[PDB]
Design a protein around this ligand. Structure first.
Ligand SMILES: [Fe+3]
Lengths: 136, 48, 336, 48
């Protein structure tokens, strides 16, 4: 139950109750062009910069009001890499894809402008104690 | 010759440190250093 | 992988001593020697004795002090003379007009303003002044003009003010007048000392500042200080200053007579703007009037230059008064 | 009386220590003490 570390990165999953970032505007609905064993390719995402979707997840409706979610290893051009393979993904079903946050403060503010809620500690201190040996 | 106009017997060191006490806290009561009570009181809102 | 590692490590302090950019050399006046040298040794000091002092500003907050290195002439090996602390200093935001008494001046880019104390001796350009009041937040201080062995002078905006009192590096060796020195200031930090090769060089010419007598003090003309308007009869009043009696006390021009010095007199030069016409020496009174005899010979002098100085045994004061005044009255300026 | 001809403000201490870093080593790159880089380089053979 620690769930706390004094590191540079955000230490928060994009969209959690701590980031307070609304992903609904960033939702993208698309029909995949081609599905392979490990790669799902679509031309619509080809218009975004490389790594835009890295860290995001893909959710689609299985039955009723329940959706199955899959994380994305990497995004490059028109090809998306799916962790654990693409098995179970419908070839023509409607898919919802959300972006992913790298966690860096520059990434957090330039893309999402959520710097005030940034949970990371970029440049407060790395080691400096007040009971060391020589300050200089 | 004679006693200097002034003598540098020691230096005063100033440092500006930023630190965190953990997760959200309600009230800070006192600060103790080297067994001497430096400050005692109570603050419940962001301030100086 | 997708994630990247950011820089944060330890961010080591950047001590890396730099050379001093702001500094100055000065000659110690009699005021400090009076209060730092015992009378027994002081009385044996000849009139030609001179002492050297230096002032500097900290280039970085990580430097504690600097080392003083100097040599005689342009040749020889530098001999360490000691270390000194940083001298608080600031920049004048507005010009300082020629006026005796306290004057309010605002300082910009002030450094170590907190440590300044009232009553200290401050030197700017070639004038020594006394601080009367201090404002920490706004950096506004009141300065007494024309103190010790100095006289008021025009100081343009940007002049540097040094509060050398208790913040000067002094070389104890005694040097005779007329010798030229080359000295350098080396910064000192916990990481070590600055290499001499990177230290700036400077030269100064001694002039026996302590030897020369103080100039006259209260300089009031017809009851006015530095007036451009006098109605006819010319009356000039001056004060007699004795360096020995004053000792370490700072006395400005507004104070009255403090007695003369043994063998010290007052000399006045009268010019016609560019040419020298009359010269009165050996003056011992506190006032002088232009004799009626020379008024017709020289005629009306609408533009009159007044030069005042003190001389003893042919030793003229380092500084002097000089102003060109305009006369008005009957027979003077009736073109209007 | 007067300033002494010289003043002993501090002592300089010299020590000769022999130590081992463990089993065979290939290269020693740098030595760091009190957070300050005393020496940086590279040596691959017995020497000074
Ligand atoms: Fe974030």
């Amino acid at each position: 139950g620690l769930t706390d570390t004094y590191c540079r990165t955000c230490t928060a999953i994009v969209g959690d109750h701590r980031c307070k970032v609304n992903l609904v505007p960033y939702r993208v609905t698309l029909t995949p062009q081609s599905v392979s064993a490990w790669v799902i390719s679509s031309g619509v995402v080809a218009g975004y910069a490389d790594g835009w979707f890295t860290g995001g997840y893909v959710e689609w409706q299985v039955d009723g009001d329940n959706y199955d979610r899959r994380f994305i290893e990497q995004h490059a051009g028109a090809d998306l890499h799916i962790l654990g393979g693409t098995e179970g993904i419908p070839a023509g079903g409607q898919l919802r894809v959300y972006p992913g946050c790298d966690g860096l403060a520059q990434t957090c503010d330039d893309k999402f402008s959520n710097l005030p809620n940034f949970r990371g500690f970029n440049a407060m201190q790395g080691k400096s104690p007040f009971d060391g040996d020589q300050v200089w | 010759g004679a006693k200097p106009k002034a003598q540098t017997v020691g230096w005063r060191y100033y440092f500006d440190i930023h630190f965190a006490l953990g997760k959200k806290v309600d009230e800070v009561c006192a600060i103790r250093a080297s067994g001497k009570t430096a400050w005692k009181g109570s603050i419940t809102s962001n301030g100086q | 992988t997708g994630v990247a590692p950011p820089p944060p490590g330890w961010t080591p302090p950047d001590r890396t001593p730099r050379a001093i950019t702001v500094r100055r050399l000065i000659e110690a006046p009699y005021r400090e020697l009076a209060g730092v040298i015992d009378p027994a040794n002081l009385q044996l000091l000849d009139v030609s004795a001179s002492y050297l002092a230096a002032l500097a500003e900290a280039p970085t907050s990580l430097s504690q002090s600097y080392t003083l290195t100097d040599r005689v002439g342009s040749s020889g090996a530098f001999v360490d003379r000691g270390t000194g602390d940083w001298c608080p200093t600031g920049l004048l935001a507005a010009e300082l007009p020629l006026a005796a008494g306290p004057n309010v001046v605002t300082l910009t880019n002030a450094t170590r303003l907190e440590d300044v104390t009232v009553g200290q001796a401050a030197v700017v350009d070639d004038e020594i002044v006394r601080v009367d009041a201090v404002n920490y937040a706004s950096g506004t201080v009141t300065l007494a003009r024309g103190c010790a062995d100095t006289v008021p002078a025009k100081h343009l905006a940007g002049a540097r003010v040094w509060f050398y009192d208790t913040f000067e590096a002094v070389d104890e060796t005694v040097y005779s007048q007329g010798v030229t020195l080359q000295a350098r200031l080396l910064t000192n930090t916990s990481e070590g000392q600055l290499a001499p090769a990177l230290a700036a060089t400077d030269s100064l010419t001694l002039t026996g500042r302590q030897g020369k007598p103080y100039p006259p003090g209260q300089f009031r003309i017809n009851g006015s200080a530095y007036p451009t308007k006098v109605y006819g009869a010319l009356s000039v009043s001056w004060a007699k200053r004795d360096r020995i009696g004053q000792a370490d006390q700072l006395i400005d021009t507004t104070v009255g007579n403090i007695g003369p010095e043994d063998g010290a007199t007052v000399t006045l030069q009268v010019y016609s703007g560019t040419t020298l016409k009359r010269t009165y020496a050996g003056l011992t009174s506190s006032s002088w009037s232009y004799p009626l005899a020379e008024d017709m010979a020289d005629g009306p002098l609408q533009d009159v230059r007044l030069v005042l100085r003190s001389v003893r045994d042919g030793i003229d004061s380092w500084q002097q008064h000089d102003i060109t005044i305009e006369r008005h009255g009957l027979g003077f300026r009736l073109g209007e």
